[PDB]
Every structure is written in structure tokens, then in C-alpha cells.
Symmetry: C8
């Protein structure tokens, strides 16, 4: 509530990384730096999503 942010960070630990990304207030973005990942980890969850499942999650988050 208080942060004005709803969403989550996502990444894969699989063979081909896509780095960290996030859905923030329904907007998908890439995150370039680990400082930002740790900053957002204080206010939103951070989960794992395989590279092959990102397309379907995108569709559901639309």
C-alpha cells in the first residue's frame, strides 16, 4: 500500500539468463543494476520465472 508499488521482480537461474526484470504497477521493465534489485526487494517480492514461461506470464499480466 504505502510504497505506491504493486508487482514483483523476476529472473531465471537457468542456463540463459535474461537478467532481472519487474512488473511494477502493470508495466514490465528491465533492471540493469543489482543495487536496484536489492532496493526493490525491500518492497516487492522477487521470484523465479523460467525464460520459456515469461511469454505466458506477460499475457496474464496484460
Amino acid at each position: 500500500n504505502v510504497s505506491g508499488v504493486q508487482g514483483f521482480l523476476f529472473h531465471t537461474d537457468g542456463k540463459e539468463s535474461y537478467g532481472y526484470r519487474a512488473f511494477i504497477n502493470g508495466v514490465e521493465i528491465g533492471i540493469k543494476d543489482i543495487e536496484t534489485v536489492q532496493g526493490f526487494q525491500q518492497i516487492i517480492p522477487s521470484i523465479n520465472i523460467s525464460k520459456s514461461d515469461v511469454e505466458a506470464i506477460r499475457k496474464a499480466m496484460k
Copy 2:
């Protein structure tokens, strides 16, 4: 705070359909176990028999 409402579902019965999910009212198939474990951090994961998926789809519409 996740901006996600829904659940993962699978059956432990004879004819598995793997893992699927309802995410914000959209049904999807899940290809990898990593994704199942990731979403298990933020949404419930329940069992649904293959025979009951059609009725749950109607209710989730």
C-alpha cells in the same frame, strides 16, 4: 503487494496435465518447475482433478 491474484493447479491422479495457473483471471500452462516454485512464493498451489478443470474455468471466467 505482488499485483497477482490466482493459484497454481495440478492433479496427482492418473492423467496428469502438468502444472497450470490462473493469474489475474488468465489461464496459462507452466513449462518449467522453476516457474512453479517461483509462483509458489506468492500464490497458493492447489490440486484440481482433470475432470474438474472445465467447471473451474467456467467459475474463473
Copy 3:
């Protein structure tokens, strides 16, 4: 409201069973298998409704 499901399972322990049914997001459905009943029991309540009272509950849930 993390599950995206509001409702309840219902059944009777009376002489003439109607099996398990549910109201899920205002939609009434039949449940065929016990696995599904136990799955939904993790996220929604499960109560008893006599066969003779189902008609009135349907009217109120409309």
C-alpha cells in the same frame, strides 16, 4: 484476496447426497472429485447445506 477466489464449498451429510458443489466468484458449479474438494478446502470455506435449503441459498447468492 491472493487466490482470486471468493466462495465456499457445500454438501449435505443427509440421506440423499447431492455430492460437493461450490459457489466460486458467484458461479455455482458441481465438483466431481475429492481431490478438487481438498484442493479448494485450502483456499475457501467448506460448509454443510441441506438439500432442501439449496434453493434458498441459490436465490441469495444470485
Copy 4:
């Protein structure tokens, strides 16, 4: 509250009983069986209302 039900059961312990009744999502119903009363007691409150006060409560619940 995940049941999708708002309301209460009501009855009187006074001289002229009207059995159990309920308001469920703003709809008043009669309850025919004690099994149903016990089922709804798992998800909604159960209170006492004198027969003389039911008319005024109906006006307020409209």
C-alpha cells in the same frame, strides 16, 4: 473474509418462535434444516432477534 457471503442468521428464544432465518447478501431467507444453520454458523454470525423487531430489521437491511 473469503466466503463471498455477508449477513447473519437470526432466531428468537422468546414465546413465539419463527425458526431460523438469515440475511445473506441482503436477501432474507428461511432455513429449513439445522444442518444448514450449523453450516452457515461456520462463516457468518448467528444472533437473536425478537419476533417484534424483525420488521424494523428488514427495513434497515433493504
Copy 5:
């Protein structure tokens, strides 16, 4: 939330009683019997309001 009732019971312990009354979902009603007062005391607050202050509370509850 669960009861589908928002409001309060009110009465005075002053010299001229007006009995018990209630605001239920923005509707003011009189309560005739103590059974009903005790029933609603399970789900809504019960406060004291002097007879001379009822008019102003009515205006604010409109």
C-alpha cells in the same frame, strides 16, 4: 464486514428514556425488545447518546 451490518445501537441513561434505537446501514430504527439489543450487541457497538443530542446525530448520519 462479514455481518453485512454497519452502525450502532444508542440509548440514554438520563431521566427520560427513548428506549434503544440503532443506525443500521444508514437507516434509523427503534428496537422494541432486549433480546434484539443483546443480539445486535454481538456485531455492532452500543453507545450512549443523550435525548437532547439525538437530533444532531441524526443530521450527521443523514
Copy 6:
């Protein structure tokens, strides 16, 4: 669950205005201490100087 949002207010300063309240955005005077004690069961009771009531009225509008 009371269906009431607001607060009682009074001053302990030199020029008392007795007790007043904002109830659901309506300002009222309270005539009897019984009513003050009744509403103290369901809403906060705070102090407001007589000089500040005009600005609080503007904000509560």
C-alpha cells in the same frame, strides 16, 4: 463497523467552546457529557484550540 468516521474536539485553553464533533463530515455541537462518553467508545477525542477550529473546518469540508 460503526459506520462513523470522525472525532470529538474541545479545548483546554482559556475560552472553551465545550465539546464538538465531526461525524461523517458534518460538524455538530454536543450538549451532554453522556454523548461525549458514548462517542468516545467509537471515535477519537482530540484537543483543538479555539483559534484553529476555522482551519480544521476548511480541511474537513
Copy 7:
């Protein structure tokens, strides 16, 4: 949200005071007396804002 008030008190402890002010339900007001500051401190937060930052906070609170 029992008090019907959303907002905060603000002041600076810097060299040039602007006294205490508040945002109450999106309306900015000045507070003249400490009694009122202590009264509102029972229901809303009270924070520090430098005189030079008030203009930007006003813009964000608009």
C-alpha cells in the same frame, strides 16, 4: 480509517521556522497553537520538512 482524517503535520527545526502546518484530506492548513498540534499527533503522523522542500511537497500533494 475511524478518524475521517488522512494526512500529516509538518514543520522544520531549521533556522527559519514556518511553524506547524498540515495536509488534512488533501487540504494544506497552518496550525496556530501547540494544543492543536498535540491533538492531531494522536491521529496523524508528524514529520520534518525543510522550508526549501515545502514547495516540492505541495506539488506532490496536489
Copy 8:
């Protein structure tokens, strides 16, 4: 949450600082004084965002 403020403070601990900034009710502002940072830290989260990631966060906070 009674402050009427949703958002967060952000800064970087990386090589090129941009000082402290904030999103307050969907409005981005610069913060000039540390007193204001400490004041808002009483009511909103304070996280780290790399300078390289600010552009994407602005897009998501729009």
C-alpha cells in the same frame, strides 16, 4: 496507512550520486535537505535505485 502519502525515497550509493529523490503520490521530486529525507523516512520506504535504472522506474511509476 493514515498519512495520505504513497511512494518512496530513492538514492544511489554508486559512483555518480543524484542525491535523494522521491515519488510521492505518483509525482517525482528532488529533495534538497537531509531533514526532509529523515521526515519522510518516518512514513514511506527509502530504497536504493542505481542512476542507470531511474529512467525505467519513472516509466513504471507514470
